[PDB]
Amino acid sequence: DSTECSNLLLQYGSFCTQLNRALTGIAVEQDKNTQEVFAQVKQIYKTPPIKDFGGFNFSQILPDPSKPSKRSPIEDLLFNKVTNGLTVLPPLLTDEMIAQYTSALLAGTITSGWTFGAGP
Amino acid sequence: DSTECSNLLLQYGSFCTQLNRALTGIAVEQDKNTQEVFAQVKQIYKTPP
Amino acid sequence: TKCTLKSFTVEKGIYQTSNFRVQPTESIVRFTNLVKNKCVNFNFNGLTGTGVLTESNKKFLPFQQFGRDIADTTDAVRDPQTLEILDITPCSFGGVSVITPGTNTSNQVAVLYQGVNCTEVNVFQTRAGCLIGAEHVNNSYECDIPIGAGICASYQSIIA
Amino acid sequence: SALGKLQDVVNQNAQALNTLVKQLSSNFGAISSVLNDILSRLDPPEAEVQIDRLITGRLQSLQTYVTQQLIRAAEIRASANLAATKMSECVLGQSKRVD
Amino acid sequence: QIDRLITGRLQSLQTYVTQQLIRAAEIRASANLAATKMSECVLGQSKRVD
Amino acid sequence: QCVNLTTRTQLPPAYTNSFTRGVYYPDKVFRSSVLHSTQDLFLPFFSNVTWFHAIHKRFDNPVLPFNDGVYFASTEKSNIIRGWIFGTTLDSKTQSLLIVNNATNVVIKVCEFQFCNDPFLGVYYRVYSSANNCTFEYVSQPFLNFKNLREFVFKNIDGYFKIYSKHTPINLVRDLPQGFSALEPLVDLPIGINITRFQTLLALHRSGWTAGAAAYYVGYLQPRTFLLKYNENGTITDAVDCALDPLSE
Amino acid sequence: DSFVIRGDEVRQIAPGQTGKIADYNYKLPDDFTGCVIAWNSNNLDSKVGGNYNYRYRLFRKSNLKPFERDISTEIYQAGSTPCNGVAGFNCYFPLQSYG
Ligand SMILES: *[C@@H]1O[C@H](CO)[C@@H](O[C@@H]2O[C@H](CO)[C@@H](O)[C@H](O)[C@H]2NC(C)=O)[C@H](O)[C@H]1NC(C)=O
Ligand SMILES: *[C@@H]1O[C@H](CO)[C@@H](O[C@@H]2O[C@H](CO)[C@@H](O)[C@H](O)[C@H]2NC(C)=O)[C@H](O)[C@H]1NC(C)=O
Ligand SMILES: *[C@@H]1O[C@H](CO)[C@@H](O)[C@H](O)[C@H]1NC(C)=O
Ligand SMILES: *[C@@H]1O[C@H](CO)[C@@H](O)[C@H](O)[C@H]1NC(C)=O
Ligand SMILES: *[C@@H]1O[C@H](CO)[C@@H](O)[C@H](O)[C@H]1NC(C)=O
Ligand SMILES: *[C@@H]1O[C@H](CO)[C@@H](O)[C@H](O)[C@H]1NC(C)=O
Ligand SMILES: *[C@@H]1O[C@H](CO)[C@@H](O)[C@H](O)[C@H]1NC(C)=O
């Protein structure tokens, strides 16, 4: 909050603008990275209520209805196992929506094979 | 080996620790690169005589 | 936004233009009366700063006067007049971002105060911050202007 | 150590933020690391010099932080591009690419 | 005098470390490509053109 | 009044291990559940500390160089140790510091005292002869099988005299117990004087004279780095000496 | 800017100086450009009986701005007691003459 310091800082020009712009580019790049990785389907697919897949069990990777976070047991374990002018911007996609995207991808690859990635 | 220089250098903080950490990261990264490229088999195969 | 971008025409998007500061209201010197729960300039035994002084549940040992976190910033302090512990929360600084469509389309804007609660500044509270000037709707559309934490803004007035 | 790759990224970001905070406690050759102490103990002709030393030290610290953040951002972008490729080729189809 | 020498040498060392980090990123990209070629050309037959 | 004590028994001084004792709080700052690395005058871990006895005929009151700081450990019962002698030349030419604890209070004085060659007190069931120019007087509240363990750290930094102390209830018979106890800061004195030598003050028991059973230890403070652990409640529960062994490094 | 001062006060006609005529008579800015010219005038601006025509501001409440002139002949309050425009105990004229 020192006004004399800011008056002396104005002598150095637009360094602050360059630092803010570089950090802004990194911040939008993170959202673009998440968008490229997880948002590869524009249809939110769901598995059928009856899990008759010819003996194949996907309960550890399908979302758990008992959990409020709607995550898979594997995803729940993964989320549990990872632990002055500064601000942290939130990510554009929340963890619930990333989990929803993974659920849609899992439902597509279970019910439809590789057909959903190439068309209907 | 100048102790006055090091005493003045301590006023600048952890710049030296940052540079050493970056160089150590590069140094372990080179070994990781060689490990990734060449150590793709866990069995040492041998040609017949 | 035109001043920040150095242009008279603004493309559709969100642009961080300014930095919201909670201005200090009073000066509290304790060696005057003590004022709590407000962003004030505190001067405790020669240690000065600006912050919100709230009640603390941290029990200091009797020889200790100030408190520091992991990052060596003073976040707890003892009043010298009355031996009580006060937490020093930093004032609610934030980034002021302007959400607008193209100036070819409209001149309506919305203001996002990042990481600032709406009681400390068409007013909607997001996890990204307080959004003023956008009408929150229950319908879901594709993201046009990203706000954050799953919130997006679009022009149809400005909706979030 | 199964999830060490994500933990390294989290630790590096937290450690960079902590280092950027701890650089404020360094005087960089000035009489004090606190601007208020310099402004209260000295007249503006010499306080200007001490504040200038603090400004150049803190600006160098911030430039160092932004530069290393950009390098880490390039690394994370490469990893994310690889992850998007694996999402397209391993999840959305069957890949003939070995390993 | 030592303050001038320290800031000059620190700037030189920071410049060297930054260039080394950028070159290390380039070499890491080349090594990732080489590992991909080792997996897909040596350990298998690749249908990828060129 | 001065009295020569001529009934002592000659014995070499003893030595023992410091273990992980001598740690004190470097500042007045609360820290919670965090590890803090600090560079200060600290006592080295597992160091060779000089051991002096008071038993009957042993009466150990020599004058020792202060160096950069003094760690005083006391395995004490019945309060024989009462104070300390601080100065440079210990005569009326210079100015000396006196710390005494009599039956009522503790007195801290910075004056030009004439110290005796053998200064002591006495309890029935004599430390100076003159005081010329006083500049600072401070009267305070009393600080105080071997039952009590008294740890003290004395430092002379920027004309400030820091006294750190800790009282510990022990039941060990002879040597220092092995454990961890961080020393709280007790009192900072604005003395602004040069101190290079010190001497312990004991109390006689009269029924000639008899020395009560006490034992004390002198350690020397060296500039080094400690890694201190602060718990949730803010007390130092463990420490690491960064220059002891490569593991702690 | 022309004036007459003492011999020891010529160091105070400079940017960034702390002094008496610097604060209450003539202040130069920190970013001052120009030249200060000083020469001895004992042969002209002095009298054997005492030349009292040159006066300086002994008392003022606050320091001047750069290039600020104060010619107000109002009384100064040097104590807790108000002066009400009248000299007395702790009430002094601000302008005193050089001997
Ligand atoms: C699919 O797999 C799950 C998990 O392995 C099976 O759920 C287990 O069922 C047995 C007996 O039915 C229980 O003893 C376990 O405690 C269950 N484990 C969990 C994690 O719930 C499930 O039976 C399998 N089959 C189907 C059709 O869902
Ligand atoms: C106790 O013993 C000491 C040392 O033997 C005495 O100190 C000496 O006193 C004589 C008396 O004139 C001096 O000439 C010496 O210079 C002193 N020596 C030192 C090293 O200072 C002391 O006087 C004795 N106490 C009494 C009461 O006689
Ligand atoms: C302590 O020092 C004495 C001599 O001063 C020596 O004989 C003894 O072995 C030392 N003890 C240790 C544990 O080093
Ligand atoms: C202890 O010393 C103080 C000052 O030297 C004195 O006032 C007090 O009476 C003494 N008490 C006893 C019991 O000797
Ligand atoms: C110190 O004491 C001596 C003897 O009483 C005296 O002559 C001298 O003036 C004193 N010094 C000061 C500074 O008072
Ligand atoms: C302090 O005393 C010692 C021993 O008498 C001496 O060597 C040193 O120069 C003194 N220091 C000062 C500042 O007087
Ligand atoms: C801290 O204090 C609490 C009392 O509120 C106590 O229950 C707890 O055991 C203490 N913890 C330690 C490590 O001393």
Numbering used by the authors:
A (entry chain B): 745 to 827, 856 to 892
B (entry chain C): 745 to 793
C (entry chain A): 299 to 329, 531 to 620, 641 to 675, 691 to 694
D (entry chain B): 943 to 1041
E (entry chain C): 992 to 1041
F (entry chain B): 14 to 69, 77 to 145, 158 to 176, 185 to 247, 257 to 298
G (entry chain C): 398 to 496
Pull verbatim passages from the article behind this deposition:
Having identified that residue identity at position 484 likely affects head-to-head S protein oligomerization, we aimed to further probe the chemical properties at 484 that mediate this dimerisation. We therefore hypothesised that charge neutrality at position 484 (as seen in the Q484, but not E484 or the recently emerged K484 S proteins) may be sufficient to reduce charge–charge repulsion at this site and therefore allow dimerisation. To test this, we performed site-directed mutagenesis to substitute an alanine at position 484 (Q484A) in the Kappa S protein, purified the trimer, and performed structural studies. The oligomerization state of S proteins harbouring charged residues at 484 (E484, K484), along with the Q484A and Q484I mutations demonstrate that abrogation of charge at position 484 is necessary but not sufficient to permit dimerisation. Rather, a combination of charge neutralisation and additional contacts enabled by sidechains at position 484 is required for S protein dimerisation.
